[PDB]
């Protein structure tokens, strides 16, 4: 199993998750088709594994330093998660829909535990953390694939663009989205700061 | 144009994203490939025409209300893009990367403008749109890839569940994400408003 996702990783990259077929993952290997589906019960099982190793490889912000605040701690995961997402053709793709592994139980939990010691209900910790992950992922995936489409896509009309909008593609165009990104962070650490002041 | 759409939608959610294929398109139309290929540039013009008239058809709350608030405006304007993805297999999908359409300028520029009106500066409305888009994105993509994924994927071992996981677990197993949504989308609001007092 350790083997094949290091080529799967390599196969993905290279042709897409949509690429990452049984035949050419097979081929990759040197193994018949039935082999691969033998250990590797589907794809999805294929993408869950990937999913759970990219982020052992590349985030490498999980866990709380000693003494830091919920708020730093909820930004420094979060660049870290993107982070991890992007460095992978199609990774926050393959995140999209997965559950915490057995592997990675200790690391969440160690999230919702400090979230419900700085007074977060385990319900809130979560859904904050939840919203975090799921801004981080639309974020990364809008970026991916708008970059994907440049090549594809006609060069926008421009003639007749109203003021805000031109502005706004101005600004869209000058980073890669990483300010708009941060600038999402903050409103929402600042929205769970509203929150559980309110509610202690 | 009109009723190639009309097939790619019903194709689309026959086969997903991956499925809605040259070949199967042409087939649907009764044409040869050549002749879908001639007016129809490629993939990504007919993913894009789709993004939009998913939104035509289905995204109803597009514009403020008289005298509605920001806040307001907001979460409806969210939990309408939120409905309109839902309708369609992959219709998140579709979405990520796209720009703005000429036939959506007026649209976009009155969101960005109620923003501005309200006392947002033009890039802080930007990321704050951005981020409510984001976030939705993310949100409805993992609901949506959760689901499909319950076939292939094996019930997860809950023998070694520690416990803030096992309960936030049977939470999210409790409805269909709609709960953490609309959490998230408040904390969002929370935010800016945090943000945009302040400067003001
Ligand atoms: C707590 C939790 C998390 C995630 C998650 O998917 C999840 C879930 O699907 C159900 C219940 C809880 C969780 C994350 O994916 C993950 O990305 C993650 O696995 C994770 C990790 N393994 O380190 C994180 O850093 C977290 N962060 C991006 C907010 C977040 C934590
Ligand atoms: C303003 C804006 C928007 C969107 C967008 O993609 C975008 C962009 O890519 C560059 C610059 C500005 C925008 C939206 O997709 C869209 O979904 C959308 O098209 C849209 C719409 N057409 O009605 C919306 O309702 C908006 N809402 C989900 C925040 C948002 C508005
Ligand atoms: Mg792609
Ligand atoms: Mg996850
Ligand atoms: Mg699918
Ligand atoms: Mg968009």
Redesign the interface.
Known sequence: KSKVINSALELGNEVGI?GLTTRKLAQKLGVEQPTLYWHV?????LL?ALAVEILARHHDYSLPAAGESWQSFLRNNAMSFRRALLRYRDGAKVH?????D?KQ??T??TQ??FM?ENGFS???G???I??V???????V?????????LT???A??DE??????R???Q??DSDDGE??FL??L??????????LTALL
């Open positions: 949509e019960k589907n794809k999805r099982a869950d999209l829909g997965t559950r915490p057995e139980y200790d969440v939990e919702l535990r419900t385990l319900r809130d979560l859904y904050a939840s919203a992950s799921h801004f981080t992922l639309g974020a995936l809008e970026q991916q694939e708008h970059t994907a489409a594809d896509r006609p926008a009309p007749n663009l109203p003021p805000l909008l502005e706004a593609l600004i869209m300010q708009a600038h999402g903050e409103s929402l650490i600042r929205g769970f700061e509203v929150q």
